[PDB]
Amino acid sequence: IKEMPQPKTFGELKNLPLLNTDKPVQALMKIADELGEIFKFEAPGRVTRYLSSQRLIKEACDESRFDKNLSQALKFVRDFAGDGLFTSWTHEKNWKKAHNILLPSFSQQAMKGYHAMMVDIAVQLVQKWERLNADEHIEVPEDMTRLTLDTIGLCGFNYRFNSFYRDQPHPFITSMVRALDEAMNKLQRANPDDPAYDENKRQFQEDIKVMNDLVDKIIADRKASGEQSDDLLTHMLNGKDPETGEPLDDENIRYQIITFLIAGHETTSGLLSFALYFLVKNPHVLQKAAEEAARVLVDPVPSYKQVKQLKYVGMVLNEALRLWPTAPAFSLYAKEDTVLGGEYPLEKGDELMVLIPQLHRDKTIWGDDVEEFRPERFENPSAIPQHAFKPFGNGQRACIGQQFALHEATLVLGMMLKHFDFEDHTNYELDIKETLTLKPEGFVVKAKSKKIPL
Amino acid sequence: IKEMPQPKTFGELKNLPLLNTDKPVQALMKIADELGEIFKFEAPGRVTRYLSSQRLIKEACDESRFDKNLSQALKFVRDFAGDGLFTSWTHEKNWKKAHNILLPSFSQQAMKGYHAMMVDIAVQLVQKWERLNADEHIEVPEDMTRLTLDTIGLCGFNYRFNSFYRDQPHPFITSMVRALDEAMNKLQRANPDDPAYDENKRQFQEDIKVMNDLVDKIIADRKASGEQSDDLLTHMLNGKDPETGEPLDDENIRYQIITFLIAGHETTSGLLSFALYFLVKNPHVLQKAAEEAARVLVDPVPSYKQVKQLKYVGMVLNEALRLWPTAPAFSLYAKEDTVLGGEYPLEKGDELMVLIPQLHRDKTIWGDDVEEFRPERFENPSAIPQHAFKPFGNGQRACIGQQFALHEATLVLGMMLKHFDFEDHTNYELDIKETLTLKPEGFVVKAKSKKIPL
Numbered sequence A, B: 001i002k003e004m005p006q007p008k009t010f011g012e013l014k015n016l017p018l019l020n021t022d023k024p025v026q027a028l029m030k031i032a033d034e035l036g037e038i039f040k041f042e043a044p045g046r047v048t049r050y051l052s053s054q055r056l057i058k059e060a061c062d063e064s065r066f067d068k069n070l071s072q073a074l075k076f077v078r079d080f081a082g083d084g085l086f087t088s089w090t091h092e093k094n095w096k097k098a099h100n101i102l103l104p105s106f107s108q109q110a111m112k113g114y115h116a117m118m119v120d121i122a123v124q125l126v127q128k129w130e131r132l133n134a135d136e137h138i139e140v141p142e143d144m145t146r147l148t149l150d151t152i153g154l155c156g157f158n159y160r161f162n163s164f165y166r167d168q169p170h171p172f173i174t175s176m177v178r179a180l181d182e183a184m185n186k187l188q189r190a191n192p193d194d195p196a197y198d199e200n201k202r203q204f205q206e207d208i209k210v211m212n213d214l215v216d217k218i219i220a221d222r223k224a225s226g227e228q229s230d231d232l233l234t235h236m237l238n239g240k241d242p243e244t245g246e247p248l249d250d251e252n253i254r255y256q257i258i259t260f261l262i263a264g265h266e267t268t269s270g271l272l273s274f275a276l277y278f279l280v281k282n283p284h285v286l287q288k289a290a291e292e293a294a295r296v297l298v299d300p301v302p303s304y305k306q307v308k309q310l311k312y313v314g315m316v317l318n319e320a321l322r323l324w325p326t327a328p329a330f331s332l333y334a335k336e337d338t339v340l341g342g343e344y345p346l347e348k349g350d351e352l353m354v355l356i357p358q359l360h361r362d363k364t365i366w367g368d369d370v371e372e373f374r375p376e377r378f379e380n381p382s383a384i385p386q387h388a389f390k391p392f393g394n395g396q397r398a399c400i401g402q403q404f405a406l407h408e409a410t411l412v413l414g415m416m417l418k419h420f421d422f423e424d425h426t427n428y429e430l431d432i433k434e435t436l437t438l439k440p441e442g443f444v445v446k447a448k449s450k451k452i453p454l
């Protein structure tokens, strides 16, 4: 039985002021570097324990001992995402119902069905970059957000955000980013009902209204339609849970649309941005990935099977998720009194935070070179110990979109590597913007066309 | 020998305050309706005479008697267009030099060479409209400006404005519209050096700077690439005048690029916008034009020969130019003392304004039904009397871009009518915005895809 380390305190505010930063996850990573595999984090009225080692996280991921918790971040996101899949408790009827109804939308058959629509948006990205004039640059996270939002909109809902027709952000994206930024900024507030935050509350409610206006349109467009889609929205509106025999109700469907639009693009745009960052910073890796893209993508547009054959591109994406997992933490609660790691007694209800970027830097798992970008770590994924690589969370509450996101990202990165040479013309200094999720900010490159037609 | 009518005066300001309107051409048309084929227009320090009848305009179009004048509008535009083709005097060396160098850029061989690049931009417009969601509308003049600017940029200069990648105007367009608007607004100013206009002068100089920054880039991009292109810019940079044996100088080339970018898209965007307006207001005419497009455009993209075959679409465009010629006036001066129409003595140097929309409503030429949209007026072209139809001006100073504009507009309207049904869903009330040039403002439609693939 050991005493846990704890970072510096601020009297009655305990550790809460450590979150007074626009980069809280990066601040918690530096605390983990200083304190090691576990530290206690106290705020007025609550406590959590941040885990960073595979040794402890393998126990936290035991579903007999621990269940998904709503972190403070997810309790704030639930103000607009409700009992959608991401912000529901495992014990809420609508979690297992929606899980059973929507999992078929991510089957191999469903994925083959989304492929043509993913290609539609990927081709729009390639055409945009082919059409740039001499010495014009690419705003990477901006174009990756255009691609990923359009992809989940079209594949999921047969709705065109038409992000490549806009030089300004879509109103949905402005409102979504401001809602996530507010949830993050609320983490540091000792007194969230201080009238100082009344303007924040008004702006938050307006941003929720903008997101719900978009959901209204997606639903109306579908119920009107004389087409026959068989997509994610078809399953939301028509699917029956085999267990209860019930379909989703209208209120829950609205929460699922909001959930899948946000979760289904924010994280994937981050991944593609980080992957391109690591490729331009590691030219031998870029060359190996470009050689694979040239060898495999022999047709004007990629087939489903060709994307499955881009092994090295997949390894690049996994290595980007290792260093900068774009949903960088998840929360658990103890189902019963238990002892963690033979050293740390927990009571029923006690909360843990898994700090995924730190798990992914565990030298006992990955070796001393953890900061190096080396896709070859994923040559045989079976070599990775249980619960060592967790960019998609854990168990029955793991990411439903994992295969969707990796297919989209592999297709798009494959086409990018086939069609262009890339230049880090500014020698960009990585700057990671936090909105609960992680993404490079201000990342620009130049693309030189290889002049290969579509 | 007759005395000319004159509209209402404002004491020492004479007729100048009649131009204190954002719709001066439409105001002059209403004056012509009241006063007839000729009226005197006086301002402090000058006089011109507005002509509205074919009887008088056929004499004004005699190049032995009258030469092109710079109107006050063109003298203000010359502040940025210099001695480019539009704002040069016929007797300036650089007019005939540039005319001889650039005329071959509008040959049939040149037009066949521009066709593929016109199709590139037209396909971008069709894809934009195919990608709209249920019950979304089209902003017609906004999308026609996107198309026409992109077309002259790509065909003329191998430069991509990428207007379909923007929901906000290109900086060039904002600056160009504001410079034309300032030229129009300056027409009414009795005291242009009043300090009240100091902000107008600063903004005008800034807008000239933005336009010249774009010209810098177009030239640099070309001189860097080498040649490879054989387009309008190739002739500007390399062509020699067969008469003098001289190429254009650097200063004149810059003025020609500004001239062709402005003239080469503002007028054409207005034509396409008015043509679509008249088609949705005249459904029998829309059906005839749509039937021709379906019958002729049998391939995924139109050929040069197929566009030459769209006779009825061409008649629609000519009938839109009859009612709303988008460069709606041109100015002449008397080369010598002469008598106009046996009734109006003029002295050498005396100025005339041809009010083209009024010429085009001359009932003695067209019949009593001049306000009706009837493309069949153009079914037997030789039947149009000499100098009755002047949307491209007159003689050696006629529009150099006439064939380019009508090819672009016939291709684009043909593809629009092939791919979509149109609905005037707001029962739009025509509102004509003036910036020297004419274009509908606030014109919106709904397009229903015919689901014909590209």
Ligand SMILES: CCCCCCCCCCCCCCCC(=O)N[C@@H](CCO)C(=O)O
Pocket: A024, A025, A028, A041, A048, A071, A072, A073, A074, A077, A081, A086, A087, A187, A258, A259, A262, A263, A327, A328, A329, A330, A353, A436, A437
């Ligand atoms: C609607 C679906 C999309 C939801 C957005 C995805 C969010 C994914 C990441 C959420 C965790 C971010 C970690 C924030 C840093 C942190 O450690 N927070 C703790 C602070 C201690 O209270 C907490 O929220 O308690």
Ligand SMILES: CCCCCCCCCCCCCCCC(=O)N[C@@H](CCO)C(=O)O
Pocket: B019, B024, B025, B028, B041, B048, B071, B072, B073, B074, B077, B081, B086, B087, B187, B258, B259, B260, B262, B263, B327, B328, B329, B330, B353, B436, B437
């Ligand atoms: C650089 C290439 C683009 C040039 C801009 C195209 C301009 C087309 C001109 C259209 C006619 C403008 C008529 C304005 C109304 C008018 O009648 N103005 C008189 C007023 C009397 O002085 C004048 O300008 O004296």
